[PDB]
Amino acid sequence: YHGDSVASLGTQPDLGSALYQENYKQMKALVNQLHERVEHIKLGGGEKARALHISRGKLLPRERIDNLIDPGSPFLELSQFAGYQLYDNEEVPGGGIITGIGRVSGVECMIIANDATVKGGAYYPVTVKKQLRAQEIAMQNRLPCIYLVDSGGAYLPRQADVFPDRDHFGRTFYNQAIMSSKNIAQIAVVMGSCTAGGAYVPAMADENIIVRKQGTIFLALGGADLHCRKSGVSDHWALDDHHALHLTRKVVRNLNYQKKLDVTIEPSEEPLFPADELYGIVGANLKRSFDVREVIARIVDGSRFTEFKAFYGDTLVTGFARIFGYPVGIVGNNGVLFSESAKKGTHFVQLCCQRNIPLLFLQNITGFMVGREYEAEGIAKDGAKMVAAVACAQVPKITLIIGGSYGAGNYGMCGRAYSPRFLYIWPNARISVMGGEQAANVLATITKDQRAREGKQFSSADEAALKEPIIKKFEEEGNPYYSSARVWDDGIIDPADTRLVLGLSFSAALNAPIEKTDFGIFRM
Amino acid sequence: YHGDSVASLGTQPDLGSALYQENYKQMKALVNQLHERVEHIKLGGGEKARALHISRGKLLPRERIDNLIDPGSPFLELSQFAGYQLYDNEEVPGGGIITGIGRVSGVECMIIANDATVKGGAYYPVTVKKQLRAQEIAMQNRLPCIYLVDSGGAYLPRQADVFPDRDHFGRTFYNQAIMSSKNIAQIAVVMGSCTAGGAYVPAMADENIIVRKQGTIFLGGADLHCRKSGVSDHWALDDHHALHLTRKVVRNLNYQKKLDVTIEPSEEPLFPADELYGIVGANLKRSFDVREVIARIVDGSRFTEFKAFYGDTLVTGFARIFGYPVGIVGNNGVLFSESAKKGTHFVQLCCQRNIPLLFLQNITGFMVGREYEAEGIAKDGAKMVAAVACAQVPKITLIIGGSYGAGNYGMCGRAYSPRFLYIWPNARISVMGGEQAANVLATITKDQRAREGKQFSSADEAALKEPIIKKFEEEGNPYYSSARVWDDGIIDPADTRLVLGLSFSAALNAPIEKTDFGIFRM
Amino acid sequence: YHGDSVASLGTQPDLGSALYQENYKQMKALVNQLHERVEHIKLGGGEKARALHISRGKLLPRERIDNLIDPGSPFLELSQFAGYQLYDNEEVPGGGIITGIGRVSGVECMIIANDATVKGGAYYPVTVKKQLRAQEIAMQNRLPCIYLVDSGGAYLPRQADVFPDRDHFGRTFYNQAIMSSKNIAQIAVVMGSCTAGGAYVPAMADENIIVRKQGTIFLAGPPLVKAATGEEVSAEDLGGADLHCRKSGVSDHWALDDHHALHLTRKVVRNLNYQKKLDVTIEPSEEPLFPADELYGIVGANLKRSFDVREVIARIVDGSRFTEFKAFYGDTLVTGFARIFGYPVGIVGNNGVLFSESAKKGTHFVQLCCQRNIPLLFLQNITGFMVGREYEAEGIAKDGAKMVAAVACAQVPKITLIIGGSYGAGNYGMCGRAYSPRFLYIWPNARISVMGGEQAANVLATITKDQRAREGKQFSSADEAALKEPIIKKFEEEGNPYYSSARVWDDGIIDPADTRLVLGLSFSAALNAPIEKTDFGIFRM
Ligand SMILES: CC(C)=CC(=O)SCCNC(=O)CCNC(=O)[C@H](O)C(C)(C)COP(=O)(O)OP(=O)(O)OC[C@@H]1O[C@H](n2cnc3c(N)ncnc32)[C@@H](O)[C@@H]1OP(=O)(O)O
Ligand SMILES: CC(C)=CC(=O)SCCNC(=O)CCNC(=O)[C@H](O)C(C)(C)COP(=O)(O)OP(=O)(O)OC[C@@H]1O[C@H](n2cnc3c(N)ncnc32)[C@@H](O)[C@@H]1OP(=O)(O)O
Ligand SMILES: CC(C)=CC(=O)SCCNC(=O)CCNC(=O)[C@H](O)C(C)(C)COP(=O)(O)OP(=O)(O)OC[C@@H]1O[C@H](n2cnc3c(N)ncnc32)[C@@H](O)[C@@H]1OP(=O)(O)O
């Protein structure tokens, strides 16, 4: 009997309240800023570079992606802000590469396309990191990889940050070989002149498509006709960009792959409240606190939520819901973490792992302005319990940072270091080891005590002098754009699109089967 | 019948030749420089810090490691040069942490000890990278991990490089939890005051040992944690008692090492190792036969070459080190299609027979050949790159000379996850040689300017070349690569045999899995 | 480096103290009583029955077992006191059957022999339970089973307690078939006339050995055949060694007499092609540093007094070496690592009332032992509630369960020894009989029940008084006293170790001086089977 009636979460906010108006105004300003910056990034490398690229008879990378994917299918771009102000004087729109997940011939695939307009397609360190992240996502979710290779190889300056280390350029070929060995299809489309680094990519790909004249593969001489007829590196011969994309679609169709789901499914229903109210509900000030249940009610199917252990450790919210017919276990933050909250989270994570249910984390860690210590030693014994449970979980984990994320709370709530399938942040998020004010006080006290043992007086004025720069540095570093410029936290997302982004991410992540979970020693 | 006689590799070098004398002099100078720098690094954080540390009654980290391991057992320290001149004005001897592999109660274990004298044990980014590398080594080789925790947490400045990212501090706890779940024992000895980051380490460890007064886990103390909070698992009076308890705990692990590969009696090489100084020298332009190096590091100087006359620029064959079968793949010149194919065949054979692989890299500069139709090499170089990546046997890479371009990837570079990687003091690593890079930059700028209609000055090409050559030389230095956690540590060539034996003995703990290969272009 | 020195547990007790003398006297009296009762049980069914059995040319069952096993090898008999005063007027020495573990041709095997002198080998309910327990032990430890079949079938009276139910006689054949399917060898030696129930045993066995004249296998005896169909036939003609060997083909070997049958059984066991391999590491065995007989004085016979379990541990472990785990947290529970005869073991003992900290510490230790694949040994001495009426036991419930689950889900070999009281949920927590330990033993001074007699008496009086008060019936103060005296007596009689041993619970009683030897034999037997991985349920936390 699936007809039983069930109470629904969420409540209607007070639109007339001044707090709602102010929060809505701040969030709208942030979202407009994000949209305009994304537009400028989408503009590309530059006018002259784009003109030359079009004159050569090639298609712009975004046009290539648009023609490659199925008509009208949504595209989930990743890390649009990579390289945003990362380097002092060089502009690298989008990191020089484009990555995302789209549907090709009815199959979800990961697409990696080089933007030839940005430094002739040379690989900056951020470009390598972005490509490695995309490859890791594809390997974890068992998604076929499609490469639109048009690059000039590694950026000769800054070679030390791109060539030598483990997570440097060679890891690309390593991942390609491993994923090929694991039956994850690799398809390389040589849409332009490659280089020594670029040349290896088509060689390791299972199937190659090279354009007649623009495509040129040389290890350091290289052409479509030569590679197709004598060297044999090329697998398909394409007249131009459109023909290459058509051939790629055909090749993807001939993959003989069928997606099968392990989790149960139910008909999808929209949430009972508009998503745009999240602007007023959340606002842009981290000092104020908002109930995460509103956010949950505005992003779940039918606003139906089954809370688990509601009255025990109420600072943490856990329960079961469904997004687009997908069961999910939601773990959100409603305040400071305590021992009871950690135990409740561990219990919920164990339940979800046992039942093979995907997990969703909503992080809003709180500053220590309210509580200086609160005998945090008790928290250590139990915080670890969660950190381990989260790490050992094998179900798909998606983390969304809707507010502050500081200290060990970031690790506890499935931080970037614990390998979530996807990680997103809202435009108002802040991430750092601790808040700037708290950090400033710690540095002043340590220096004063050490100086006192040394016998050097520590000036009271000096403590104030140290505090002002530290607060500014922490604010600049914690910015969402600072974190997105580095490949951490994938990309920033408009709160109004949270439901769609989560649905797409879970649909992509459900491709891989769910394995059994093995836990370590649970310190009692 | 194992009595059959077999020819032995190697030949006696000409000591009287001036080239041998010059090479020996250069290598001796390099080794002396390395030894003195290692001594200074071993000195520690500083005199005042060491005096304060001894005052508080604690033991110095090297003394802790010496007392922990079995008496007289060798210790294989890793990445001794981490943080060497990495930061502009701050000195971080050894990266602030000590990692290595030693035998505790007859069991090989990975030991990670914080040096409290360096910035009070605060974690620099290089410290986090070094600890992560040690944890990865232990996980790959299934070695128990022992932590001598004495740290002040993450360095508050430079927090962005230590806290947030995947390979940042949280990966430590992630690896700890995973290795605990995989039955790899975790033991934490709280030998001093920890912090927020330090506190989590003992919590996630299977067994904890905390000193009575120096140990403080946060408010936090040995008595409190042992009696009321229950975080501590053992109570130790002082450092010596804690080390004794750690030895007992390791003894109670119920673990027995079993080998899959066959073993034979060990025999010493037929030639002295110190002749490698004269044979190799310090000049990368000159070429030396890798067969000499092989003959001076294998048991009895016995080598069975495979495909000797096909692709002679690459040397492959079978030998034994300390009774351990090994497949040696060395460089004798520029890589060609035949060399790539031969290497792929040998790697397939070794993977099929479950034999550990050893790579000796000496990639050559392009001064001799500008292009040589390198397009042919691309089709076949990738076949070797894949074969190397897909291999599941233990792989150890040693860089005895230059390592440039895709040759680094082909010969099991750092990006392809070898179990261990070492470099000799005369090695050079970079994307390409400085001279070659200088020419490429000048040509690209001139051609782009010509299309633009801007004349590119001939003097400008010379102006660009001199700085590029200097930058490439400084970046390629072995100490530059060792300061970053790449290439573990530098090793004296005279100790290559011992280092390889220890590394293979450690790596043989884990069982050898089956190898699955991907699509092959051929 | 295994040469490192290690502190040793245990201390020298004060022999001159009067408490030691009194405890020693009480324990010596108990042990002497146990020894004399065991001697009387070993005497057998009776003089006339033994005389008839010998006159028929057969060997007594104990002689059969002695000749079967390897010369000089120790024999670990199980449940010697089964059926001791179980039935009102019928005496069933040893339950009518003999079970134990011994070495045959260098292989540890489980031996089940029927005592024909007791009721002509008829199966009492206790006999069926004992045989089922032996079969379960053999299946768990993967030990070959040897049956010396000489029985008259199910006891016709009391048939309802032997035939119908799941744990009744048919479970014997079920276990035989399952163990045969799992490559655990089954060998049946028909040493005497069987019956309908007895006949099926040789049929299901992989190999049969039947004596020439004494052995007779008939699916229905002559009297049974006459009752069922009115047919007259001699016992030998209906079922005999020659007939079964030559025409019916049920018999696999033909034996002239008992000695020949035992020799053939030894040969058959030799041709099993089995080699024992150990998974756990081994070390040279060393004797404990203190005499075992001091346990008499240390423990005594009074459960009210408390003794340190560390003494018992120090007197039964190799070299008296013990590595305590979490010594100062939850000190009422003792946990640590030691070695018995070179075998690693995790010891979990009781030193007082169980608390939340003790339960958490036990759960942690059990998880560690399961992860490292180390056998577990439980020493139970649960305490009465005279000291603490409630102590907010609600806190204990939240954490006691965690231990109960951890213990249940463990897959390592578990051996439980009850050295004192075992009451309430503490019995379940410390690997009670319901949680399937490989072996369970009790000392002669142990007491087991749901709660102590005094505590139970108070509970019954209060419940009746409150219910009567709501009813409006006055509950007499004298009535409360009247209810208390019988309850205390019933609890004392039921809790007796002999009461529990008469039923097949707790296997057998063991002299404390032989605890080390018994544990060594039990662990050596249990190490035959490989150690599987352990999967845990939800750890409520
Ligand atoms: C993997 C391993 C193991 C090793 C290797 O991979 S070693 C790879 C060596 N690379 C090459 O061998 C490619 C050399 N390029 C060329 O042959 C072409 O240039 C193309 C193919 C790039 C097409 O580009 P193009 O020629 O059509 O146009 P262009 O405007 O000239 O393109 C931008 C201009 O390139 C300059 N530029 C700066 N850095 C680089 C760089 N690293 N690579 C290429 N170009 C770069 C840029 O600064 C200037 O513009 P700017 O900055 O002055 O405005
Ligand atoms: C994981 C997550 C998620 C979060 C975290 O982990 S947030 C961790 C916050 N850290 C603390 O809360 C520890 C604060 N220390 C202390 O409480 C003590 O100091 C000890 C414990 C360190 C012992 O050291 P000590 O007190 O015995 O000696 P001292 O000489 O004072 O030791 C050197 C002096 O420490 C200065 N110093 C600089 N940077 C740091 C730093 N990051 N931590 C500590 N000290 C630092 C150094 O500059 C000066 O010496 P110098 O450079 O001036 O010569
Ligand atoms: C499995 C399923 C599904 C079904 C079945 O199994 S249905 C099995 C039906 N059983 C028989 O068909 C065997 C009938 N016995 C006989 O044919 C023989 O007796 C032998 C073979 C038992 C040898 O014994 P024996 O003949 O050499 O000596 P005896 O002294 O006579 O032996 C003791 C005397 O047996 C009396 N006695 C009481 N109860 C029984 C009992 N249940 N079975 C046998 N005897 C019993 C005892 O009371 C008296 O002695 P007591 O108590 O008076 O002192």
From Swiss-Prot, chain B:
Annotated effect of mutating residue 171 to C = In MCC2D; mild form
One matching Pfam family = Carboxyl_trans
In terms of domain of life, where is this protein from?
Eukaryota
Q: Which residues form the CoA carboxyltransferase C-terminal domain?
A: 268-514
Reaction it catalyzes: 3-methylbut-2-enoyl-CoA + hydrogencarbonate + ATP = 3-methyl-(2E)-glutaconyl-CoA + ADP + phosphate + H(+)
What does the UniProt record report as the effect of altering residue 393 to L in this chain?
In MCC2D; has some wild-type residual activity
Question: Quick one: effect of changing residue 482 to G?
Answer: In MCC2D; has some wild-type residual activity
Q: Using the UniProt annotation, give all residue ranges assigned to the region (Acyl-CoA binding).
A: 302-331
CoA carboxyltransferase N-terminal domain ranges (all copies) = 27-265
The answer on whether this UniProt entry bears the keyword Acetylation reads: yes
Provide the assembly information.
Probably a dodecamer composed of six biotin-containing alpha subunits (MCCC1) and six beta (MCCC2) subunits.
Kindly provide the name given to this protein in its UniProt entry: Methylcrotonoyl-CoA carboxylase beta chain, mitochondrial
